[PDB]
Amino acid sequence: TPVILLKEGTDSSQGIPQLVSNISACQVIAEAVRTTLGPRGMDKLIVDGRGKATISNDGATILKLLDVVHPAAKTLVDIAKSQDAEVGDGTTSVTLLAAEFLKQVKPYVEEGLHPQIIIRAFRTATQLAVNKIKEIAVTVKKADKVEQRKLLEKCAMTALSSKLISQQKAFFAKMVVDAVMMLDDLLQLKMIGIKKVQGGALEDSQLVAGVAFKKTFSYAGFEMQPKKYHNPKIALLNVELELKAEKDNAEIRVHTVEDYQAIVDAEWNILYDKLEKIHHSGAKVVLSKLPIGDVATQYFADRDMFCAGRVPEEDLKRTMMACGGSIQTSVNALSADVLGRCQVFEETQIGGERYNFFTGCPKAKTCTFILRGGAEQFMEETERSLHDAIMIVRRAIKNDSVVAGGGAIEMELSKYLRDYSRTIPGKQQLLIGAYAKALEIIPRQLCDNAGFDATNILNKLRARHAQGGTWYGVDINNEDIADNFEAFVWEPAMVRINALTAASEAACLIVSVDETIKNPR
Amino acid sequence: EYGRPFLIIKDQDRKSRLMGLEALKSHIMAAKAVANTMRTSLGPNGLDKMMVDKDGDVTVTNDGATILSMMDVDHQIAKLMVELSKSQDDEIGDGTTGVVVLAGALLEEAEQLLDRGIHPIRIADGYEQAARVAIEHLDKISDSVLVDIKDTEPLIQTAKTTLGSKVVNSCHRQMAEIAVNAVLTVADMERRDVDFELIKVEGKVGGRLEDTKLIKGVIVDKDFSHPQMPKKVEDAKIAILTCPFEPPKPKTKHKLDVTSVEDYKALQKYEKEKFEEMIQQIKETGANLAICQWGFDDEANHLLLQNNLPAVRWVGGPEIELIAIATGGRIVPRFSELTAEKLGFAGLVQEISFGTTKDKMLVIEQCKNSRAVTIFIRGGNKMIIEEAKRSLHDALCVIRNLIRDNRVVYGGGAAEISCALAVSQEADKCPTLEQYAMRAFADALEVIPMALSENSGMNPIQTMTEVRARQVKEMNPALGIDCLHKGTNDMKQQHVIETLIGKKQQISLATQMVRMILKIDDIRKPGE
Numbered sequence A: 001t002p003v004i005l006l007k008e009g010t011d012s013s014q015g016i017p018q019l020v021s022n023i024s025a026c027q028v029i030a031e032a033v034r035t036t037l038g039p040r041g042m043d044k045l046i047v048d049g050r051g052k053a054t055i056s057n058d059g060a061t062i063l064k065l066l067d068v069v070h071p072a073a074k075t076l077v078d079i080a081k082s083q084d085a086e087v088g089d090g091t092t093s094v095t096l097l098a099a100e101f102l103k104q105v106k107p108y109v110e111e112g113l114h115p116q117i118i119i120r121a122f123r124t125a126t127q128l129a130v131n132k133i134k135e136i137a138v139t140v141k142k143a144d145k146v147e148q149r150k151l152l153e154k155c156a157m158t159a160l161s162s163k164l165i166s167q168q169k170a171f172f173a174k175m176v177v178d179a180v181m182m183l184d185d186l187l188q189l190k191m192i193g194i195k196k197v198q199g200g201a202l203e204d205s206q207l208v209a210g211v212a213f214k215k216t217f218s219y220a221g222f223e224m225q226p227k228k229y230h231n232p233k234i235a236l237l238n239v240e241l242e243l244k245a246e247k248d249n250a251e252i253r254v255h256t257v258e259d260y261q262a263i264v265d266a267e268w269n270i271l272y273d274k275l276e277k278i279h280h281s282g283a284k285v286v287l288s289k290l291p292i293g294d295v296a297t298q299y300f301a302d303r304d305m306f307c308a309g310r311v312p313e314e315d316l317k318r319t320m321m322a323c324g325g326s327i328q329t330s331v332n333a334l335s336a337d338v339l340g341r342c343q344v345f346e347e348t349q350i351g352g353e354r355y356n357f358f359t360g361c362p363k364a365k366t367c368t369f370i371l372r373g374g375a376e377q378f379m380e381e382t383e384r385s386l387h388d389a390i391m392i393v394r395r396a397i398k399n400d401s402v403v404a405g406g407g408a409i410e411m412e413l414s415k416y417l418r419d420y421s422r423t424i425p426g427k428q429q430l431l432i433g434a435y436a437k438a439l440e441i442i443p444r445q446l447c448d449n450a451g452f453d454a455t456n457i458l459n460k461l462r463a464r465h466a467q468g469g470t471w472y473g474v475d476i477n478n479e480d481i482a483d484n485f486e487a488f489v490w491e492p493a494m495v496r497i498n499a500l501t502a503a504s505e506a507a508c509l510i511v512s513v514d515e516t517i518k519n520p521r
Numbered sequence B: 001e002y003g004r005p006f007l008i009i010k011d012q013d014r015k016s017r018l019m020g021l022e023a024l025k026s027h028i029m030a031a032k033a034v035a036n037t038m039r040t041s042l043g044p045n046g047l048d049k050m051m052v053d054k055d056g057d058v059t060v061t062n063d064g065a066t067i068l069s070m071m072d073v074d075h076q077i078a079k080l081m082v083e084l085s086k087s088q089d090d091e092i093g094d095g096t097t098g099v100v101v102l103a104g105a106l107l108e109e110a111e112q113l114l115d116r117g118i119h120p121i122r123i124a125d126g127y128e129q130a131a132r133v134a135i136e137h138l139d140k141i142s143d144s145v146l147v148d149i150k151d152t153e154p155l156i157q158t159a160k161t162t163l164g165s166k167v168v169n170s171c172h173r174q175m176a177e178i179a180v181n182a183v184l185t186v187a188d189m190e191r192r193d194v195d196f197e198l199i200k201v202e203g204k205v206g207g208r209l210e211d212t213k214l215i216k217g218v219i220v221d222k223d224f225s226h227p228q229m230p231k232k233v234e235d236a237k238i239a240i241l242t243c244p245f246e247p248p249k250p251k252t253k254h255k256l257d258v259t260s261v262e263d264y265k266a267l268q269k270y271e272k273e274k275f276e277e278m279i280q281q282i283k284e285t286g287a288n289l290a291i292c293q294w295g296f297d298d299e300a301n302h303l304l305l306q307n308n309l310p311a312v313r314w315v316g317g318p319e320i321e322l323i324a325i326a327t328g329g330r331i332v333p334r335f336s337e338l339t340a341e342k343l344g345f346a347g348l349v350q351e352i353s354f355g356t357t358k359d360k361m362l363v364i365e366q367c368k369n370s371r372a373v374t375i376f377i378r379g380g381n382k383m384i385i386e387e388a389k390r391s392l393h394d395a396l397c398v399i400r401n402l403i404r405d406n407r408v409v410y411g412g413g414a415a416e417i418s419c420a421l422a423v424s425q426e427a428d429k430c431p432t433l434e435q436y437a438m439r440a441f442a443d444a445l446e447v448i449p450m451a452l453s454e455n456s457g458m459n460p461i462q463t464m465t466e467v468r469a470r471q472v473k474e475m476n477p478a479l480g481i482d483c484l485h486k487g488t489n490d491m492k493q494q495h496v497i498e499t500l501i502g503k504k505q506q507i508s509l510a511t512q513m514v515r516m517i518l519k520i521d522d523i524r525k526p527g528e
């Protein structure tokens, strides 16, 4: 007693009281995101310490902004980022499924059932559940080109149904699909630029098959040079075209004024040599990451050619990929190949700002979005919904297998597990039965949000599925059930498969905890 | 044991939360307060507000965007109305206060629908449908007017309508003339674009408000370098320079070694000679005046005077690029590169002196065709000058839209009344529970004629009822509120005009904002 084993302030709890308290803790996390699911879901508004406000419907984003410190709840936060980093859609579905798994086995833990028996039960059905999804997934391996452009649109619209831009999903889906089909075979996400300019209606958004970026800081004389060309040649640079000192490690020592005047004229002759080398190559538009001096701009003005400096790195790489040139750090080898060709260049006004447009490139590998909102959080929320459409199409390209949504898939799995538990004896019958009950939370949370009789609809759905109607889900508008595969409610097979494994792994990990020790500070 | 205090969130005690309908109702009350503060400032008979800054500065203004910008607010919904006002201002520049009144009255009509058991997504969907029906009817009653320098009377009438709501209305016939002419001398017709960086608005206190004039040249806040130079020239050939009037200096680190007396004397001669060559090089090209961006030396200043050549010192960056465009010259960075083909021309350059103060200004006038122009504002108070600058900026933006789109509708509430009837007409055919949403939209579209009548001193309900019946019996969609007490109700005869894009932006922007407010059902704040 006088010398205590562990330092003072150490917290230690264990047993059934500790484990049950973890189950109830995860219910609060699943509560924050519960009513954000469905064609009729809401948003949440969160304000941090500094007063900045964020309005979002993305499930993964809400959990990040919460300051969760409960060790067991942090597991549900991480699986949200897991679904975010792999498929990008289904961050709330994997959260509700996680909480429902734990709540349905909670009474058995009170009865004293050994958790390792519970763990074996979860891992048994997941291999059955996953193998059921792959069997009944619908695909057409024959390569029809117009069916592919229709399948991707149906997948894209269904990913936008629960977002702020639902009223224009048919308009945005066409824009998103066109973006991906011309984005190479590796599909770098940096090859797509999303810009945000205030003012204007939502239908004024546009897609430019080229590169467009913001006007940069320009020196005196920028305004006497033309702002439109038809067949210009673009010379991309990484060289600072301004009068300066050659090397920071340089030093000049001289005796006579005759050399003094010769040295003063030496700096000008260097600068005029580079600018004369560019002008002879026949290029009309010059872009450089480094600053462009006023002398260069005035010189570029006298010959009706356009200059731009301090262009961001990312915007330059997209311009090279869209025009087809190369960055040059020297002005001695400007061959005809290192230049970029576009079909028209112009500078226009967009909502109070000035933007440079490079449009008309037939060999482009890059697009750019111009989003028009009314407030800062209006376009930020708009881009977060666009990102869900981009990633969904990217996955669908690699594997074109879809299943019907709207709760149709959760009832086919639950019926299958219910018809398999009755075959096996023992406590393995109750655990799998409780597992199959947790799979019908998704159809219940859709009806609860909309405002129907959630009890009646589930009874109708359960009878249709067991009658032998595989793809029957919920009808939001008609307050009934209907086939969602002929109603064009699709989603890739990857979204559900990645939903089960992450949900099953989180439930198994939490149940397998015995005691928690927290040491001071 | 079951529910003993267990921590889930950092600082769990200090954070509040609102869920359910009490969340939506709190937003509506916050939104209504902003709209009722700025209901007064609508229409020609509107009143103003006097803002007070953080440090004590006083600003009296009537512009919708500025009031919501200088205001400091805490409620998150209030900041959403501020951002709504700014977005309309950037895109159009006129109709900043009208939109927030429409947005506010659009939320108020939804309170009854929420109470009667309607899911707000149904309300939000209904509002979107009504706006589409209203917009397609809006350009069915439009009237393309004109864009041409020959006539300029339709453009003046539109400029008169916008200025009629400000304190500038005391002389708004004159101010309309200045605004329209300024745009048409900078406007590029083929690209259908105008650049505001070529229009300089400068105001100086004193004088009278009616002394405002349009100068088709450049005015700078400088004077001649030497006090004894002449104060005017009449055939100015302008030489614009960028290098200073000093002996050269390389930028890289350098040292010059003097090792003997003859070396010292050769350096002394090189100094004084260098001063001569620059001024000789200027004069042989035939230049009459010299404009420089940097300073002069004492030796170089006097030699200019001795050669009868006025000059200006320490001018600004943007000023130089304007003078180059205005006078048609070119900018040279070295004396050596100066030629006779690069000089500009100017009919008159003068120094104008105001009253008791020492302030002096230089003005460049009477050139050839100029793509640059400046507005000069005078007035007896700094608060007039600020107001005159903002009101004139309103006039220029409206004319810009007429360049973009050349069809207009008639204001004074005539457009709103006619749109409301069209939406109400469509509501009688849609039976799928969405009819209630549409009638709430049309009722919230009449809040602009109500706001106009109340300020004019009439009775709202009677005045609107008579006008709406007339628009149904007759086929006249151009009857509004007679806020100036002239006798007639036809806005076509009274010459009240508003651009089409102004109206389409107002309706489309407000409806899309409500669809975001109505979609929020939760909130989390840290207490104080």
Ligand SMILES: Nc1ncnc2c1ncn2[C@@H]1O[C@H](COP(=O)(O)OP(=O)(O)O)[C@@H](O)[C@H]1O
Binding pocket: A037, A038, A039, A058, A059, A089, A090, A091, A092, A093, A094, A158, A159, A161, A162, A405, A406, A407, A442, A473, A474, A476, A489
């Ligand atoms: N047209 C539709 N009919 C019925 N349900 C739909 C429809 N469109 C989307 N859903 C439902 O939306 C749910 C998920 O929406 P989403 O926001 O993508 O979830 P998550 O946030 O988990 O990605 C799916 O379970 C699906 O049932």
Ligand SMILES: Nc1ncnc2c1ncn2[C@@H]1O[C@H](COP(=O)(O)OP(=O)(O)O)[C@@H](O)[C@H]1O
Binding pocket: B041, B042, B043, B044, B046, B064, B094, B095, B096, B097, B098, B099, B161, B162, B164, B165, B411, B412, B413, B452, B480, B481, B482, B483, B484, B496, B498
């Ligand atoms: N002579 C007039 N008679 C009746 N209404 C007018 C007249 N002039 C302007 N209005 C109306 O005043 C309204 C508000 O304009 P204003 O007060 O300038 O602020 P904003 O233009 O930002 O709404 C416009 O809807 C316009 O129709």
Ligand SMILES: [Mg+2]
Binding pocket: A089, A090, A158, A159, A160, A162, A388
């Ligand atoms: Mg989605």
Ligand SMILES: [Mg+2]
Binding pocket: B094, B095, B096, B097, B165
């Ligand atoms: Mg106004």
